[PDB]
Design a protein around this motif. Structure first.
Motif, PDB file in Angstrom:
ATOM      1  N   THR A 104      -9.418 100.182  46.404  1.00 30.67           N
ATOM      2  CA  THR A 104      -9.758  99.797  47.769  1.00 30.67           C
ATOM      3  C   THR A 104     -10.828  98.713  47.782  1.00 30.67           C
ATOM      4  O   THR A 104     -10.784  97.799  48.613  1.00 30.67           O
ATOM      5  CB  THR A 104     -10.221 101.023  48.555  1.00 30.67           C
ATOM      6  N   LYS A 107     -14.006  99.335  57.263  1.00 38.53           N
ATOM      7  CA  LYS A 107     -14.379  97.979  56.869  1.00 38.53           C
ATOM      8  C   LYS A 107     -13.133  97.155  56.570  1.00 38.53           C
ATOM      9  O   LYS A 107     -13.019  95.991  56.984  1.00 38.53           O
ATOM     10  CB  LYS A 107     -15.294  98.031  55.643  1.00 38.53           C
ATOM     11  N   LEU A 108     -12.176  97.768  55.871  1.00 33.85           N
ATOM     12  CA  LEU A 108     -10.916  97.103  55.562  1.00 33.85           C
ATOM     13  C   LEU A 108     -10.196  96.703  56.839  1.00 33.85           C
ATOM     14  O   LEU A 108      -9.673  95.587  56.954  1.00 33.85           O
ATOM     15  CB  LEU A 108     -10.041  98.043  54.737  1.00 33.85           C
ATOM     16  N   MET A 122      -8.823  81.129  54.952  1.00 27.20           N
ATOM     17  CA  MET A 122      -8.251  80.870  56.272  1.00 27.20           C
ATOM     18  C   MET A 122      -9.263  80.221  57.208  1.00 27.20           C
ATOM     19  O   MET A 122      -8.885  79.420  58.068  1.00 27.20           O
ATOM     20  CB  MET A 122      -7.717  82.162  56.888  1.00 27.20           C
ATOM     21  N   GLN A 144     -10.442  95.035  49.415  1.00 26.43           N
ATOM     22  CA  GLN A 144     -11.440  94.457  50.309  1.00 26.43           C
ATOM     23  C   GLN A 144     -11.905  93.092  49.817  1.00 26.43           C
ATOM     24  O   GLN A 144     -12.070  92.158  50.613  1.00 26.43           O
ATOM     25  CB  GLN A 144     -12.627  95.414  50.437  1.00 26.43           C
ATOM     26  N   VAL A 172      -9.878  85.654  53.995  1.00 25.31           N
ATOM     27  CA  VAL A 172     -10.558  85.263  55.226  1.00 25.31           C
ATOM     28  C   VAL A 172     -11.308  83.955  55.030  1.00 25.31           C
ATOM     29  O   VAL A 172     -11.278  83.071  55.894  1.00 25.31           O
ATOM     30  CB  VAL A 172     -11.506  86.383  55.693  1.00 25.31           C
ATOM     31  N   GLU A 192      -9.918  90.413  61.551  1.00 25.17           N
ATOM     32  CA  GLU A 192     -10.362  89.020  61.563  1.00 25.17           C
ATOM     33  C   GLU A 192      -9.335  88.104  60.899  1.00 25.17           C
ATOM     34  O   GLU A 192      -9.059  87.002  61.394  1.00 25.17           O
ATOM     35  CB  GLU A 192     -11.720  88.886  60.873  1.00 25.17           C
ATOM     36  N   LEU A 193      -8.749  88.550  59.790  1.00 29.08           N
ATOM     37  CA  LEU A 193      -7.794  87.707  59.077  1.00 29.08           C
ATOM     38  C   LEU A 193      -6.554  87.451  59.926  1.00 29.08           C
ATOM     39  O   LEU A 193      -6.038  86.325  59.976  1.00 29.08           O
ATOM     40  CB  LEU A 193      -7.416  88.364  57.751  1.00 29.08           C
ATOM     41  N   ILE A 230      -9.224  90.536  50.515  1.00 25.53           N
ATOM     42  CA  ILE A 230      -9.117  90.226  51.935  1.00 25.53           C
ATOM     43  C   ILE A 230     -10.265  89.323  52.370  1.00 25.53           C
ATOM     44  O   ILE A 230     -10.072  88.390  53.156  1.00 25.53           O
ATOM     45  CB  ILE A 230      -9.070  91.521  52.767  1.00 25.53           C
ATOM     46  N   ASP A 231     -11.482  89.608  51.902  1.00 20.66           N
ATOM     47  CA  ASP A 231     -12.614  88.735  52.202  1.00 20.66           C
ATOM     48  C   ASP A 231     -12.381  87.317  51.689  1.00 20.66           C
ATOM     49  O   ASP A 231     -12.650  86.334  52.397  1.00 20.66           O
ATOM     50  CB  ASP A 231     -13.885  89.322  51.591  1.00 20.66           C
ATOM     51  N   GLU A 247     -15.097 102.940  54.240  1.00 25.43           N
ATOM     52  CA  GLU A 247     -14.459 101.838  53.522  1.00 25.43           C
ATOM     53  C   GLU A 247     -13.207 101.368  54.252  1.00 25.43           C
ATOM     54  O   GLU A 247     -12.958 100.161  54.374  1.00 25.43           O
ATOM     55  CB  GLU A 247     -14.105 102.258  52.092  1.00 25.43           C
ATOM     56  N   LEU A 248     -12.411 102.310  54.748  1.00 26.35           N
ATOM     57  CA  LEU A 248     -11.160 101.959  55.410  1.00 26.35           C
ATOM     58  C   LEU A 248     -11.428 101.249  56.729  1.00 26.35           C
ATOM     59  O   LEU A 248     -10.686 100.341  57.114  1.00 26.35           O
ATOM     60  CB  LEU A 248     -10.317 103.216  55.625  1.00 26.35           C
ATOM     61  N   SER A 305     -11.871  93.722  58.551  1.00 26.06           N
ATOM     62  CA  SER A 305     -11.612  92.457  57.877  1.00 26.06           C
ATOM     63  C   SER A 305     -10.182  91.997  58.123  1.00 26.06           C
ATOM     64  O   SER A 305      -9.935  90.806  58.356  1.00 26.06           O
ATOM     65  CB  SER A 305     -11.900  92.590  56.383  1.00 26.06           C
ATOM     66  N   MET A 306      -9.228  92.926  58.079  1.00 27.55           N
ATOM     67  CA  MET A 306      -7.846  92.567  58.367  1.00 27.55           C
ATOM     68  C   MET A 306      -7.690  92.068  59.797  1.00 27.55           C
ATOM     69  O   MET A 306      -6.898  91.160  60.058  1.00 27.55           O
ATOM     70  CB  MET A 306      -6.927  93.759  58.113  1.00 27.55           C
TER      71      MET A 306
END
Lengths: 19, 44
Positions: free
Chosen positions: A3, B34-35, A17, A7, A14, B41-42, A10-11, B31-32, B38-39
């Protein structure tokens, strides 16, 4: 750890992008 | 001529097992979240 790696990816995506 | 009852103690290992793994699931949930943020925003 999986996980946290997800993360981090994904950061990074981002950031790319935002660019 | 006599009889007896019986009581019981829980296992020490158990201890505060209510939160032994509650803290851990709560941390993973954070944690999830936070994930998810972030997703969001993406995707935006």
């Amino acid at each position: 750890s999986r996980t946290a790696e997800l993360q981090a990816e994904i950061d990074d995506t981002v950031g790319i992008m935002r660019d | 001529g006599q009889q007896i009852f019986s009581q019981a103690l829980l296992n020490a290992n158990r201890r505060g097992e209510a939160k032994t793994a509650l803290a851990e699931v709560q941390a993973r949930h954070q944690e999830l979240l936070k994930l998810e943020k972030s997703m969001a925003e993406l995707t935006q």
